[PDB]
Structures are given as structure tokens and as C-alpha cells.
């Protein structure tokens, strides 16, 4: 299928909440090899976030039950095996996304905004892998997530205004990485706080549409700060 039809089908799938189909369409678009527009980037991001989110939520539920279950319980092996199946599906999804990022999206990106968007995505999906990893595997996976986030962070600071929604969303997710993966709430708070403060300093120079976009993410940064400082 040609690009225009793929995008049409992807948007139709989005409306129908058929996110597997939506992701399949945007994967085909990506593999065609041309750079994505901002709209196409969002479609890709929305599709795979919904596809992976189903496995993430299932995994959280199953693992909570596994932890509550007595280690001598004969029922435990089934719960563990089921968790492992969901884990395998989660890994497959993250691996597909990371392959798209390495082979096509980061490789062909021609501007810092897109590169930051894709390196953030790389950090996000390595972070999803880190949430389910154990042992040495975990150390390297965390390293892969952190390295992507840090590079995206440096680029964004050099190339983008502090109110840019992509830079703000990066700071949001990177701060969550510090909080949830590295278990450092103090650095997570300071990361989100710095991003928020540097943004308010420049809000009043935006038009009302951009003001809306930036304000929404800034509120999410403050939402996290409130949660973490309680």
C-alpha cells in the first residue's frame, strides 16, 4: 500500500481504536524510508503507545498478583508463566519500535526536533523494557534508556526553546525515568522543576495555541512534582 492510503487507513484505525492496525500502517509508512512529518510522527507514537500500553497494564496487574501470592502456592507457577507471556509480547513490541527508530527514523532524521523526538522514544521504550528486566539484563537496558534520554536532553537544550512541547515532554519522561527506574526522587524532582521554571520564564512570548500546548505539559510536570513531594 502507498503512503497516502496508509496514512488514511492509520487515521481510520485510530478513530476505530484499532491500534494494532494503526501501528501496522505506520510501520509500513516508516519502512518506506522517507522522513515523517510531525503529524505522521504523532500517529506512529500514538499507535505504538496504545499497543504497548495494553501489555504494560496487563503486566502490572499480573505481577502485583504474583507478589501477593504465597511462594509455596501451587497456583504460583501458572501466574508466573502468564506474566512471562505478557513480558514476551511487551518485549516484541519494544523491539519492533526500537528497530524502526534505529534503522529508519533516527538514521534519516534531518532536523534536531525530529532527532529529539526519536531519541526520547528510544528512551521511552528502553524504559518499558527496564520495568520488566531483572539482573544484568536490567543494568544494560537501563543504560540504553538513560543514554538515549541524555542525548535527547542535550540536543533539546542546545537546539530548542524551553517551551517547545517536545523538549517539555522529554523532561517529563526523563524525570519519571529518574524517579521510577533509577529510584532517585530528588533528581527527578529537580529535572522536572528546572524544565518547568525555564518554561514559565518564556510562556508569555507564545501565541495562545502554543501557550496551550506548553501549559498542558508543564501542568503534568507540576502534577508529578506534587505527587513526589508528598
Amino acid at each position: 500500500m502507498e503512503k497516502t492510503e496508509l496514512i488514511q487507513k492509520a487515521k481510520l484505525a485510530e478513530q476505530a481504536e484499532r491500534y494494532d492496525d494503526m501501528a501496522t500502517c505506520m510501520k509500513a509508512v516508516t519502512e518506506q524510508g522517507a522522513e515523517l512529518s510531525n503529524e505522521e510522527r504523532n500517529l506512529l507514537s500514538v499507535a505504538y503507545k496504545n499497543v504497548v500500553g495494553g501489555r504494560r497494564s496487563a503486566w502490572r496487574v499480573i505481577s502485583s498478583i504474583e507478589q501477593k501470592t504465597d511462594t509455596s502456592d501451587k497456583k504460583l507457577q501458572l501466574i508466573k508463566d502468564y506474566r512471562e507471556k505478557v513480558e514476551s509480547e511487551l518485549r516484541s513490541i519494544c523491539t519492533t519500535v526500537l528497530e524502526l527508530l534505529d534503522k529508519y527514523l533516527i538514521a534519516n532524521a534531518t532536523n534536531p526536533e525530529s532527532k529529539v523526538f526519536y531519541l526520547k522514544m528510544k528512551g521511552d521504550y528502553f524504559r518499558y523494557l527496564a520495568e520488566v528486566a531483572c539482573g544484568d539484563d536490567r543494568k544494560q537496558t537501563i543504560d540504553n534508556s538513560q543514554g538515549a534520554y541524555q542525548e535527547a536532553f542535550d540536543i533539546s537544550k542546545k537546539e530548542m526553546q524551553p517551551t517547545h512541547p517536545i523538549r517539555l515532554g522529554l523532561a517529563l519522561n526523563f524525570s519519571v525515568f529518574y524517579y521510577e527506574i533509577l529510584n532517585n526522587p530528588e533528581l527527578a524532582c529537580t529535572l522536572a522543576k528546572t524544565a518547568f521554571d525555564e518554561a514559565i520564564a518564556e510562556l508569555d512570548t507564545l501565541n495562545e495555541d502554543s501557550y496551550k500546548d506548553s501549559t498542558l505539559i508543564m501542568q503534568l510536570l507540576r502534577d508529578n512534582l506534587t505527587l513526589w513531594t508528598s
Partner: peptide, 9 residues
């Protein structure tokens, strides 16, 4: 949980 972007629908 903490807020991250994008969000599930």
C-alpha cells in the same frame, strides 16, 4: 503512577 507522554487512550 507518574505522568508520561504520550498517554494511552
Amino acid at each position: 503512577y507518574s505522568n508520561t507522554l504520550p498517554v494511552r487512550k
